[PDB]
């Protein structure tokens, strides 16, 4: 099954094409994932120069097939079951009192490498709000990512809210609506559960380009 593709360390490639309020940018990432630990190591570069939005706002867009599904949870791992053909991941992300992102990604193997290829469109932002004004702290918090079967088609529906810490001490919420559908034949759909997701963001002091180093940790768990 798809799960067998994830028993060891897997190389990852990420490519994101973005446009936020007409500000166009691209991001390239590379690294590796180890799903038997639930761990990601990635480095992202803004290949168009300086990123026009805060790096933390792109974390969720920039591979949930690397989550650790413990044995008792394994039948309910949609993300790996869809591999190697992969899945389409679509989101709408609403920044409270500000604009929204819409994203479409394909997450799939290309040879030995797990690829996440994304298009992102952002609209309705304030040019000196928290996003386009760069007012978000360079950090990330712990979230629970809630997963249900889609009733209408073979896929999952996923819901969570991200808490982005603002530099003046407040929190910028980002409500995420997500759906995933297989690129290949249908899969068995999971019972309701969640992913416990932790992300930590850092810098390489020797890297001169605008970039983000990102280590994540993710484990599935049952409800409640």
Numbering used by the authors: 3 to 64, 68 to 189, 191 to 230
Paper excerpt:
It comprises a core β-barrel capped at each end. Running through the centre of the barrel is a kinked helix that houses the distinctive p-hydroxybenzylidene-imidazolinone (HBI) chromophore. HBI forms as a result of covalent rearrangement of three residues resident in the central helix (Thr65-Tyr67-Gly68).
In EGFP residue Asp190 is located in a long loop (ten residues) that spans one end of the β-barrel structure linking β-strand S9 to β-strand S10. Thus, the structure of EGFPD190Δ allows us to investigate the structural impact of a deletion in a loop. The crystal structure of EGFPD190Δ encompassed residues Lys3–Thr230. The backbone trace between the two structures starts to diverge after the deleted residue and does not converge back to the general structure until Leu195. This also results in a significant displacement of the side chains of these residues. Therefore, in the present context the main backbone changes are exerted immediately after the deletion and are not propagated either side, with the placement of the flanking β-strands unchanged. Thus, the deletion of a residue within a loop does not just cause general loop shortening: a whole host of local and long-range interactions are lost and formed so as to accommodate such a change.
